[PDB]
């Protein structure tokens, strides 16, 4: 809770709205945690936590039956019948504008970080989308908990995701509690033996399924503790927030 | 059997415009002044049948009025009327039913209908309750650059006249297939100085005012539907009830609550599909059907 960097009003087009087989819409916090990890490994700067807020979002299409994207022949098994309307294999798309906050541990200077971040953002992606435009990053300094409200308020205006936990399961909680599920981690099922077609022959491979937790959307000025709005990697392949379950 | 089509409609062949009211003198009818409406608040008692307990309470209402100034003693009501031809031409549908009806029709006499249509404007039935309280009513009609002046009384019991005939014959020719003709009508009255006029009222939901009057840019006027209703009050071809009413299918007046031409084998639709199915109609039935076809409406179902 020392150094934060803010990038607000980032326009991304063509975001992959399909996060799982039952969740279509906002990417989960895992996507932003992976983006932060990619920034850390590529840039060489340790990043602690990531916070994301939704300024605008819209899934392409209508209220129901979102959309279908046309496919093309790109495999080496055809050539005779590859002339008319390849099959679908549906994949939804959406368009959104977000705002990001990154917890950074860097004290060498004050202006080099802005340049190094701007260099990475110009060639980065958000859930497969392309970044159209963004504002100039700026750095905020927090020494204690009381001034954390200022760096929190620096993110206006946007809607931040907070964690409320699961009671029984997402299906019953969504109808009763009126919240929306989200993916917070993966559970391993069984180890991959054949390492031929994998993208890496050194990293161990696993079959995993998403684990669901229920979240809520809150205005930035209405957040009690800012530590509840920051996400980071946890134990047993999970993503958790610093402040735990959000309580009013 | 040649049943009527599912969708079948006709257009309107007589087009009146919204009449306008002016205040002029009987001897200085050249310069005209408009009549405004304004608003007033009145106080009175509560007299409701069946509510005698609140007979000692007050009542405050807000209404709209309209009256002549104290230096003008003549109300001038002016409007235009347009007659168009090409009757027996269905606007929607009709390839054999309309043609059969036209063949059964057009043998009737348009002269009487044209005479009565012009008489209802010349005598002065187009102007409503504004008639009472006046000792002299003068009508000026302009058509084809030829001015005519009328002071005809006895709006009921259509009588013979000379000037009415030479416009009725012109209208009759246009009715049975021609282009269009236009009449300009002006009415002068002698109500007096400061007398009250009665512009047309309008339908309104709950609001502050209890009675508002139709106006155009603050000047009192009359609805064209009301003007056209009085012109077609020529139905004298039923068994009783003289002082005729307007020509409508199941000819009825909602004000009185009685419906003439009820289900006793004299209706528009019965005669329409009986004429095409063999037997023809009488002279009064033919004139009624033709007069009601000149009026608009949709028939089918």
């Amino acid at each position: 809770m020392r150094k934060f960097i803010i990038v607000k009003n980032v326009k991304v087009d063509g975001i992959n709205a399909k996060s799982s087989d039952i969740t279509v819409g906002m990417p989960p916090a895992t996507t932003f945690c992976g983006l932060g990890e990619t920034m850390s490994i590529k840039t060489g700067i340790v990043v602690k936590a990531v916070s994301y807020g939704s300024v605008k979002f819209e899934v392409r299409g209508s209220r129901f039956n979102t959309s279908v994207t046309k496919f093309a022949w790109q495999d080496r098994g055809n050539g005779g019948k590859a002339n008319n309307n390849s099959p679908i294999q549906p994949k939804p798309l959406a368009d959104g504008v977000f705002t990001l906050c990154f917890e950074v541990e860097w004290e060498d200077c004050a202006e080099v970080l802005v340049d190094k971040v701007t260099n990475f953002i110009n060639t980065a992606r958000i859930a497969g989308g392309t970044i159209a435009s963004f504002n100039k990053p700026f750095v905020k300094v927090a020494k204690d908990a009381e001034e954390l409200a200022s760096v929190k308020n620096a993110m206006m205006p946007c809607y931040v995701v907070v964690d409320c936990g699961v009671e029984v399961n997402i299906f019953e909680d969504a109808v009763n509690r009126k919240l929306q599920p989200m993916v917070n981690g993966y559970k391993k099922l069984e180890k991959i033996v054949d390492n031929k077609h994998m993208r890496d022959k050194f990293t161990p491979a696993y079959l995993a399924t998403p684990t669901y937790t229920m979240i809520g959307y809150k205005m930035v000025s209405n957040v009690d503790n800012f530590d509840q709005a920051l996400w980071q990697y946890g134990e047993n392949t999970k993503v958790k927030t610093i402040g735990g379950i959000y309580n009013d | 059997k040649l049943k009527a089509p599912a969708v079948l409609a006709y257009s309107r062949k007589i087009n009146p415009t919204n009449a306008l009211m002016f205040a002029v003198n009987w001897s200085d009818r050249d310069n005209t002044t408009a009549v405004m409406v304004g608003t007033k608040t009145v106080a009175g008692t509560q007299s409701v049948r069946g509510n005698p307990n609140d007979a000692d309470k007050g009542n405050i209402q807000t209404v709209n009025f309209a009256n002549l100034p104290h230096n003008k003693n003549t109300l001038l009501v002016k409007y235009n009327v347009k007659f168009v031809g090409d009757v027996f031409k269905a606007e929607l549908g009709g390839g054999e039913y309309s043609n059969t009806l036209q063949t059964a029709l057009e043998n009737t006499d348009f002269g009487t209908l044209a005479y009565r249509y012009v008489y209802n404007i010349a005598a002065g039935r187009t102007l409503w309750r504004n008639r009472v309280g006046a000792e002299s009513i003068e009508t000026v009609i302009t058509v084809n650059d030829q001015t005519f002046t009328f002071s005809d009384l006895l709006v009921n019991e259509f009588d013979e006249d000379v000037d009415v005939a030479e416009i009725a014959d012109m209208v009759a020719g246009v009715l049975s297939g021609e282009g269009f003709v236009t009449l300009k009508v002006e009415h002068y009255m002698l109500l007096g100085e400061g007398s009250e006029v009665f512009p047309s009222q309008e339908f309104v939901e709950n609001s502050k005012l209890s009675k508002q009057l139709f106006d155009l840019n603050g000047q009192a006027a009359m609805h064209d539907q009301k003007i056209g209703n009085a012109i077609r009050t020529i139905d004298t071809w039923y068994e009783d009830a003289t002082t005729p009413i307007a020509v409508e299918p199941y000819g009825s007046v909602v004000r009185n609550g009685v419906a003439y031409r009820a289900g006793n084998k004299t209706d528009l639709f019965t005669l329409m599909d009986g004429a095409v199915n063999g037997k023809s109609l009488t002279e009064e039935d033919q004139m009624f059907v033709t007069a009601n076809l000149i009026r608009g409406g949709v028939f089918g179902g």
Binding site: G34, E37, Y186, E190, I192, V193, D194, H197, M198, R199, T203, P204, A205, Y206, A208, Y233, T237 | -
Partner: protein
């Protein structure tokens, strides 16, 4: 899963997916309440099959390292 999902329907007309998932006879058979004759044969079909072609592959942080 069976090739082309053909199977054979019952006299009233039902497939296995409807039969086993109607009123929880799957747990009634998996536990063994219907005997040990319909218990071994059903469990014989529960075999793994590995296939990774055209699947997403994502890196996840696991302590010191990646998976």
């Amino acid at each position: 899963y069976t090739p082309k999902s053909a199977g054979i329907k019952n006299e009233e007309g039902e497939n296995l997916w409807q039969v086993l998932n109607k009123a929880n006879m799957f747990y009634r058979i998996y536990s063994g309440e219907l005997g040990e004759e319909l218990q071994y044969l059903l469990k014989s079909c529960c075999t793994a099959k590995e296939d990774v072609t055209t699947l997403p592959q994502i890196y996840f942080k696991n302590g010191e390292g990646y998976d």
